[model samples]
Target chain A: TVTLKQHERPAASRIVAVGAYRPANLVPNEDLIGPIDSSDEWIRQRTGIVTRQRATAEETVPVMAVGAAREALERAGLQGSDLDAVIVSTVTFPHATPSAAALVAHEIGATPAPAYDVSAACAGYCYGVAQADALVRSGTARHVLVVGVERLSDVVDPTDRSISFLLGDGAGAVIVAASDEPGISPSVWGSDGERWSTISMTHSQLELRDAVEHARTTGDASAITGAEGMLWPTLRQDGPSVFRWAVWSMAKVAREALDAAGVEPEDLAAFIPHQANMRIIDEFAKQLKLPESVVVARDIADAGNTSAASIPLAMHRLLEENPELSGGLALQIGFGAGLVYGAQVVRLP
Target chain B: TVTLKQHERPAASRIVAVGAYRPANLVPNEDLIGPIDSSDEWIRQRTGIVTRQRATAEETVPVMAVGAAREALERAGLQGSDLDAVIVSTVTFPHATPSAAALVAHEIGATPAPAYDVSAACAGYCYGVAQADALVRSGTARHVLVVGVERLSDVVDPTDRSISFLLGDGAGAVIVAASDEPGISPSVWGSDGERWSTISMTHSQLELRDAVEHARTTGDASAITGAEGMLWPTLRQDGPSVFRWAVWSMAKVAREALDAAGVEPEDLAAFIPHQANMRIIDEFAKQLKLPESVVVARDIADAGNTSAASIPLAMHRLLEENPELSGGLALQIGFGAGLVYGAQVVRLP
Candidate 1:
């Protein structure tokens, strides 16, 4: 049997600085309240989102990605060309060609840096962070830039009350540099496809071509549309189910991460869960008994759920708001559409 | 300066078992000779693809993924739930809601196995392998499943001579179990995003009403194609440029992997490049002075380009075709659409 001698834990990659970029344009809940069937009180009390930025027509996925990434590099005392890799975590990338990561790499002049996009829905930020850490630890990269950018407002049907107030447009990024003690803890992530239909994109305007083809081939249009009895073909949600899953799973994963790192809950100075729902965070806080001071970036109150970019953006904004977290233990968690969830513990540099 | 330690190599989870699955339906180049613009002779000489499996109407991405995963699990002598994490590497997953990995997890009874999909285009297999190695080395997972499954046939426009006959549908997987020492050498990967547009998907059917509305609001219909380019966008390619880039980039990255691992090209028993194009392999070989016999698994002749599944599937078939590969050094290189590239060294189990 080959024996693996446990040497000193590898040094954690340094986070030289933090930065975030939300498009200047904002859409208030009142804007939706007047237009859609939802009310301001109802939307805020339910999801904690008060307003969100929407990418303008000029702000394509690549443009916003470059905007946020450049700021991240500048704050980190680095240039885009300095990075060895750029991993963009998002679901809003328009197509398979010219991945948002590649476009951003080109715009940033990181011609030497190879980049690609990774998606984990709302859990994307944590997943990207874990990937960055692994790449650094494995010596695949010395400096890695991870960005979680989303233009969900571009996808959400504002007329649909189900998911309109739950998404926002923005990007968050982190720069990880190689080191020798673990900065990132052992992470745990999982997805349950069984819950595939709990949240979905329903287009009343366009039917999936496959569904149409299946109907044409089998004369089973009913089989394709019959499942819509529970929810419409638009962005609909089972709020209670989502809340319960997010709370219990996020809490459990947080505990596992702490245990993996051999640290106590109290050892953490802050906890940043994906800002998908406010009550979910409260429920997780109650379960974990995390202090009220735990820096939960509930911009969901202002910026809905930016999915993958939520955690890191919140953390970056949170750090800017409260400088004390600069050298403290911060735990990050994300859970969403993929029914996917992940948690990581990092001691800020 | 930090002193490097001799015992610093991280251990990898062992690959206890590996398996693959292809669609039962097969379509020979002759099948496409009738409708497609190109003849079988021209296609075979160009891409080395003689035939490829085409998933039937019943073959959804998730279903094919589950089929291959079940085979992999059976071969590993483990049930689906035994897996701690599942990473699906593919670009064709249907919905953004439930990651294809999660869907596979659900189908294989590996629920809550922290599942997610990764995109490295063709380089995904090496990326997954490298990431799995780090997770196991960091002691995060005891057993992990890395799957490269793609239904590229679904996306390739049947009439597009540039890509239609050059793709395939299939899944390949490896079960990486915990290992005391390394099964993978330190890998090296790089990308030049400047060449990302060599292959691209131009037209998408889904356009937001807001995009149309915003266009009207700004009198810029340019942002919203008015059913002209949108209706009949086909896969576009800059073949000559892409071929040269693939050959040179893959060779450079492969050499980097060997250099990082402190291994010599002469020492490798075989080299498995992504089954993108035979021409790429031939060019890379001539540049590296690699013996012709050192190349293994010309399945691209029949399987076509399986993209992310190419390397691992080639390796799997290599072991099956020539068991002598066991206990031998193998150099693997993968490159594709993201212009993303990854390379690594693996010791066959």
Candidate 2:
């Protein structure tokens, strides 16, 4: 009976650095108002978005993620070769095989590092962070690069009022490495499958393809028209439903994350919720009743909702704009699509 | 100066139970021979596949995954509520939001448990298992349900001889839980993104939609014709290239995994490599130099290649046929798409 031995575990794990990449093109509400029959005032009042970043053709999801990852690696005083794993959080990648992470790894010169894509929508970034933390703490990886990136413009329908103004493109990243001191706290995460439909891309790609083929074979103009109706399966959501759920459920998750980390609300230096909506952020802030001294992230106002990229993007912006918060305590929460959510407390890099 | 508390680590982690769901419709090679200009004998001789499962519309990737996950939970003597997380490894899911794992979690009554999807093509399942092991060992999850599922039939072009006969549909699941002793070994995983084009579903759905729209607007039949030609972006591969890489690189990875686990090849009771091709399996076994007494899983003979589901589906069938090897040591390796590979040794549950 031969028994196998286990790998040694690390003493602790923490995020060593964070980086973000916002596309150069800034889209204001005026650019979207004509297509969706909405005015800038209405858009801003409803979603709290004034402007959002839109990537050009060259800034594909993987390319933007590589940009962010490079900065994360550089800031951590490590190179691409030093990473043991690369976890990408994205849903907008059009191809199913050869994940965006794989391309990002290759482009960043991290060729042979283990890489995979995680699909948890907006909650994806926190999920990647949690997995990175676990891998580092378990000694499965020494330094893990967790990237949250999305080219939501590729999926958003410009004429769809419900979703058009709320989506944006950007990438954000963090490097989790083995540490002697505690950095990341226990995560509080959960999913509501019953509410899964609250946010989804319901139109199937196969359905669209089949419809187009049927139209071509039958020489039917109606078929082509019908197929075109469902052609683009852009992001769709029941806004009120998601807003209510996030405002209520997320605050509780945030509190649990704080409790797990044994940190008090008044002692926190920052509160960084996913940049889904300004109203949700404001409501969450009111519900959590945090001290006024806390620096609440408002990245959504300028960055729009970058899905999985929101948390880290917001965190990076927060730390950049307010350098005083560096190395300070921050509580982060991410929630959406899968109707999934995750929260954790950490020391900002 | 608030410091966050650290999470407690688990003593060890191990796979407690395994289960699988193969669709009811098993298509023999003769069924595909007529469409692809190949005979059953040639198909069998070339790929060693006799029959493969195909999912009907009712048996979607998530539905099949849930069925397998339920059985795994039952075998583990745990209820769905007991799971802390559910990680689905897949590449064939059509929808972008509400990951297949979220739907599976909802179906299995694991509603509030954290769930997400991982995409790493054929290597996805082993990737999921490694992530689950790390999560449990780091105390991020108590019991994680890792599912490997695919509906390749949805993405495989029936007319394409290169890959049509090599793909199948099925779901396999494992329950990784906290343990008092080492039951899983360190994993050796890496991705060769430089060779990503060796295997891929290269067409983009967005491009297809745009083409269709352009044709409709201009009344240009050629646009529709061109779009139809590129509509079905099914799985493609350079078989010989992948085979060479898998045989050479995977065997070395397997040996590294064995060494990391401190387990000798002769001490193993079973070897369950990915059910990609029989030739690859035989060549891998020869390279590892295992004893004849070790049961080599040749699941590809009847199950075909289920991609990410291959390893677990093969593991389940191997254990069912050779019950004596139920709790014995086994080595598992998975390789494909990202040109990604993962290998590990585990005590079979």
Candidate 3:
């Protein structure tokens, strides 16, 4: 290759602040059990989820995303104008062209700051964190906002027992800034695409479009409804399979992150894994041999699995309850959908 | 913030190789004219598109992505196993979870390497390039694959004159690797979200879901079809407005990329802009006063606007047609929906 000049690289990069936005509606399991025919105690014992937040129609993905981003900017002691870029990690944003990040940027007055959406499903926030860290360090961006937002309620079929009870609606945001000292660790991230189907939608948009076209022109209800129908392509999954994988694999991923950061278990202030299930969180925290002092986040008890929004939302909640933990070392990992996973250790902000 | 250990950072980063994948199916202007009631001369004069490539169902997003990735890996003298991550940028991938990048990772045997999709419309490849460069420079990845692929035909209104004739389906890939010398410039990237509707889908998926739901239950053909119809959310745009903006704003962005790279117009060997339109390309080149020796990519003449795929695919075509241009400097800019834009100068490989 030919010789080339380079941009000014940062000496260090760090997460500066965090924020979360849970929708106004808190739905108890009592509301969900009516459709799925499952009891509240069964759900609590199996998943440890008592209630989850759900977005009203007015609180669309962008609305929740902007809510989280504004809070993060305020917490960072900055304005949206200071943002160099915005990366929203979400699979739930409805538009493919004008990314959710773009609208959030505009909504929070980050206009002309580069923005886009990332699709890594539940692993999205960690993925966004990794990219934000890289961007700030590489000097492509001085400060970046990474938003993990989703409206799982929009995609979940309340009648589908395997996935409906496990989801919630929320958005979380974090600002990664150039720093003189490191505040984030290297990421141990990868995808197990062999399990791509492990957590996915019921069908492709094309399949739905075709079915809808048939219904419109052919005037046949069969095109849209059946026991084997294309009923709006809701979220579905092999729950037991995911539960087994998360329990067995995530603990190892968490360890790799701790190793990557050169932090000992004793030095850790908190362990915040993806809030997929409370049982998985409890199981992995035990496997890591973390001391009792390392506060484990169980945000799922109320927020449930907010998919991409899980980590930062959980981190925000954890910090609110344990303010002393701010600026301390925390090991965080996110895994799901794409069958992708990303883990890293960081100074809590 | 608490002090933290840092990841090892690399001295430099560069583009290693590039590959392009155009679908085998060629669609000529004459073929499109019959549906939209336009003439070949009109399309050629207005959009400068003689033909566009359209993928068969068999050549889906991931298939084209893997094909382009394989070629790029081959040219890099690397295997899929060598990639540290895979970032696929496209808006047209049908699934919301299990990202196109994840499936691409498995297909190209790059599974377990970090994978995800980016949604930045036509600007996506440059967005991906910036991230890959950052990832390599930050020591997060030794080698990263950035694939920009789109099946625009899948989203086009075939009977609509404004967009249907100006789209094609294709993919392009690039390898950004750790370098001994800087080979890529810092990106001038941002979004103009105020213009988010300049180019966009006609309606949101949720709207379609609701309409489909009504169609199935109400058995009303009116739900899906009309002059005031839902019409399955085809790509829509204010073409003349986009044309004006591209011709005016893009030239300035290109100059900024060169200035950031410390390169003058004389130092540049190629100008590979997003192949949105031939008129925009010609207008910008004139405004920049690029010397005749500088090769300007007009890939849109054959491939039309493949959105995110345009830049890399154009770069590949430029290199193939002008082999001597390898190891020379090239300035490239991608701009479109999200109303986002990104530009960079690079040492061509």
- Per residue, candidate 2 scores C-alpha lDDT tens digits across A1-349 of 7777887988888899998899999899998999788799999999899999999988999889999999999899999999999999999888888798888888898879999999999999999989999999888999999999999998887777777689999999999999988889988888988787788875877776676677666666455554444466778888888888889988889989988999888988999999989999999999988989999999998899898999899989888789888888899999988889988888889
Standalone chain B TM-score for every prediction: 0.87, 0.97, 0.97
Per-residue CA lDDT of model 1 for A1-349, tens digit only, reads: 2222222335555555556778887787787776477788998788777787787877776777787788878887888778987888887775744467877887888766767777678888787777777667655667888888887765676566667777788888888887654567767677777787777666422244444334434544443333322111335567778887876566888888777667666777787888888888777777877776666666677667887878877887778788887877777888877578888777764
Q: What local lDDT does model 2 show for residue B166?
A: 90
Lowest summed lDDT window (length 10), candidate 3 chain A? A221-230
Ranking by lDDT: 3, 2, 1
lDDT of 3 by residue, A1-349 (tens): 2456787888988889998899978999998898789999999998999999999999989999999999999999999999999999988887767788888889899988999999999999999999999998888899999999999988888679888898999999999999888888889899988898999888888987777666556656465554344467788999999988887787888888888787888899999898998889989988899998999999999998998899999999999999999888989899988799999998898
DockQ of 2: 0.70
TM-score of chain B of 2: 0.97
Which regions of candidate 2 fall more than 4 Å away from where they truly are?
A226-230, B216-221, B226-230
| Tens-digit lDDT string for candidate 2 (B1-349) | 5667876778899899999998889889988888678998999889999999889998988889998999899999999999999999999888877798888898898879999999999999999999999999999998999999999988887778778789989999999999988888998899988998999875776667676776665566565554444465778898888887887688899999999989888899999999999888998889999999999999888888999999999999988998889789999999889878888898999
Instruction: Tell me candidate 3's fraction of native contacts, as a decimal between 0 and 1.
Output: 0.74
Query: Clashing pairs in model 2?
Result: none
The list of candidate 1 runs beyond 4 A from truth reads: A1-9, A203-207, A210-234, B1-10, B13-16, B204-234, B292-295
B320 in model 1: Cα distance from truth in Å? 2.1
Question: Candidate 1, A105: how far from true, in Å?
Answer: 2.7
* C-alpha local distance difference test of each model: 0.71, 0.88, 0.89
Between candidates 2 and 3, the lDDT winner? 3
Model 3 agreement with the true structure over B1-349: per-residue lDDT tens digits: 3355676878888899998899988888888888689899999999899989889999999999999999999999999999999999999998888799999998889878999999999999999999999999888899999999999988887777767789999999999999988889989998988788888898898888787776666656465554244357888889899988897888888888888888888898999999998888899899999998999999999998999999999999999999999989999899988789999898899
